[PDB]
Design a protein around this ligand. Structure first.
Ligand SMILES: Nc1ncnc2c1ncn2[C@@H]1O[C@H](COP(=O)(O)OP(=O)(O)OP(=O)(O)O)[C@@H](O)[C@H]1O
Ligand SMILES: Nc1nc2c(ncn2[C@@H]2O[C@H](COP(=O)(O)OP(=O)(O)O)[C@@H](O)[C@H]2O)c(=O)[nH]1
Ligand SMILES: [Mg+2]
Lengths: 192, 349
């Protein structure tokens, strides 16, 4: 149903919230009352209309297929290239993942994308990540890997990953400090 | 898991399968130098099984084909952190002990270059410093390891300790060892005497020597020991490090200088430094040159499966999901087949 402003613009008249509500209730009753074409033609005048994008698969100079993707987390940006056939090796900035991310938490984050669609050991990965700390970098690599792996998984798998949150960019970034208060939310200790 | 427990017969046929160590052998050969986590694992399981791996097997091949006439060869185990270099050295040490060599075992040269509360001045050379506590500890461990050869081996010099006390030519090396252990102040001098006597007598065919040094990179690095005037101390000033460097020269024959680099516990080295030059520096690499580097890499899939099966059979992996293939894959990923990482993970898993 159009908004009250849309109705007001149609009628070049000023309305009220309750006027709009009454009109919408009347239109709802009209719709429910088996409105025929002779009625639906009128009804539609007040009706206003209302999935992950899979990246293309490229082929290296040696002909092996891969998918490239990018992902940002906090202040860390990662670019990931996932090969169609691989032994699970992951090279981050030229360093193997267990050496780049000595933290079990970060290695778990790296595992999560592949483990979800049950493809551990199937794809090799090359990531270049810069900015942010270890956790932010791990998250960015996770996002990039999930986005790349979308191309190599089925559509149902892609939708499942989305519903699992692998494919959504974490919008949480540090809040700017405000003048006159200690932190973003911390205020100076009040002195009664 | 092998029915083969003799450390000489096993080979590639036994690669990827376990090799047991009896409690008596563990107590005698290995009173020190085994990784602390492996010591804990042995304590828990009541057993000491080391997987047979290509690095250890290759080092065993070299030591079996070693010609004692030729100058003693230097073997250097290197690899990424936690690849099992120390335990491979221990496996070769056990093999040599069973072949009845004399095992001059340095559990970790890093300990000798840092965190020393008692740093006195050598009486034999006033320009060198003593590390009596560590000297005495290593002397006790060496006595335990090589008691049987200790009495049989004799000294060939006169070794003064005090202005009135000394040891006379023909005295068993056990006399020197006892002097060093009981008299802590003389531990450094006793260690030097022991190294010198072993080095000279190995060329005389009295026995076959195996100088097994873990964390060899420490000798030619920097030390965190500061003089009384807060002055930094270089390794050579430490008599122990100086004598060990002397031992680390191929000038003699009748034995093998086996050693392992170990970034863990190193000083002024980045975490990822694992190659020989990266861990040794110009001085260390030149000193060890020529040498045979041996690469110890993470578990290959067969070895990884064998280790997982070992833990499962011991019942260590308590998590109900550990036996499943999904659990195995998750462990494999989270450890990248690295021995130390896998052990630590399975500890709490
Ligand atoms: N043959 C083996 N049998 C049993 N456990 C082994 C074996 N090799 C390695 N391990 C396991 O891995 C560890 C031993 O490897 P070690 O610590 O010597 O590796 P490293 O590569 O020398 O590492 P570091 O970087 O600490 O020097 C122990 O936790 C042990 O449980
Ligand atoms: N006190 C003492 N130490 C000895 C003796 N012989 C060998 N040592 C030990 O070995 C060192 C001497 O070894 P040597 O071959 O003379 O070489 P140097 O150390 O360069 O002089 C001493 O510093 C001791 O650690 C000896 O007769 N008396
Ligand atoms: Mg080690």
């Amino acid at each position: 149903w159009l908004i009250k402003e849309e109705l007001e613009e149609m009628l070049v008249e000023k309305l009220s919230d309750l006027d709009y509500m009454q009109f919408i209730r009347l239109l709802e009753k009209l719709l429910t009352s088996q409105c025929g074409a002779a009625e639906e033609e009128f009804v539609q005048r007040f009706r206003r209309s209302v999935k992950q994008l899979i990246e293309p698969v490229q082929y290296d100079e040696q002909g092996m297929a891969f998918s490239k993707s990018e992902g940002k987390r906090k202040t860390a940006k990662a670019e990931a290239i996932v090969y169609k056939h691989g032994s699970g090796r992951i090279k981050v900035n030229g360093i193997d993942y267990q050496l780049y991310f000595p933290i079990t938490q970060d290695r778990e984050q790296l595992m999560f994308p592949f483990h979800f669609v049950d493809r551990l050991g199937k794809h090799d990965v090359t990531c270049t990540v810069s900015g942010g700390g270890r956790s932010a970098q791990a998250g960015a690599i996770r996002l990039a890997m999930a986005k790349a792996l979308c191309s190599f998984v089925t559509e149902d798998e892609v939708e499942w990953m989305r519903q699992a949150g692998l494919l959504t960019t974490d919008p949480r970034v540090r809040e700017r400090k405000k003048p006159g208060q200690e932190g973003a939310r911390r205020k100076f200790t009040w002195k009664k | 898991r092998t029915n083969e427990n003799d450390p000489a017969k096993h080979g590639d046929q036994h690669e990827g399968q376990h090799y047991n160590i009896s409690p008596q052998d563990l107590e005698t050969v290995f009173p020190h130098g085994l990784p602390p986590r492996f010591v804990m694992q042995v304590k828990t399981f009541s057993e000491a099984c080391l997987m047979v791996r290509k690095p250890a097997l290759e080092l065993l091949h070299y030591l079996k084909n070693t010609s004692f006439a030729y100058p003693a060869i230097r073997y250097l185990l290197y690899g990424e952190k936690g690849t099992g270099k120390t335990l491979s050295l221990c496996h070769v040490i056990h093999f040599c002990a069973k072949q009845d060599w004399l095992i001059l075992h340095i559990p970790d040269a890093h300990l000798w270059v840092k965190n020393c509360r008692d740093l006195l001045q050598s009486s034999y050379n006033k320009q060198r410093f003593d590390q009596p506590l560590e000297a005495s500890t290593w002397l006790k461990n060496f006595k335990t390891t090589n008691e049987r050869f200790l009495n049989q081996i004799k000294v060939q010099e006169k070794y003064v300790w005090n202005k009135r006390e000394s040891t006379e030519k023909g005295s068993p090396l056990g006399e020197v060892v006892e002097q060093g252990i009981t008299r802590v102040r003389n531990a450094t001098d006793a260690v030097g005497i022991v190294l010198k006597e072993l080095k000279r007598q190995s060329s005389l065919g009295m026995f076959h020597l195996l100088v097994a040094v873990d964390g060899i990179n420490a000798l030619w690095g920097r030390t965190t020991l500061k003089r009384e005037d807060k002055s930094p101390i270089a390794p050579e000033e430490l008599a122990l490090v100086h004598n060990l460097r002397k031992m680390m020269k191929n000038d003699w024959h009748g034995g093998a200088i086996v050693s392992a680099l170990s970034q863990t516990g190193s000083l002024f080295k980045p975490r990822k430094a694992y190659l020989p030059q990266e861990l040794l520096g110009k001085e260390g690499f030149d000193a060890l040159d020529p040498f045979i580097p041996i690469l110890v890499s993470n578990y290959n899939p067969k070895e990884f499966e064998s280790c997982i099966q070992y833990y499962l059979e011991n019942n260590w992996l308590q998590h109900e999901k550990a036996p499943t293939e999904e659990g195995k894959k998750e462990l494999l990923f989270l450890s990248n087949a690295n021995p130390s990482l896998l052990e630590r993970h399975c500890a709490y898993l």
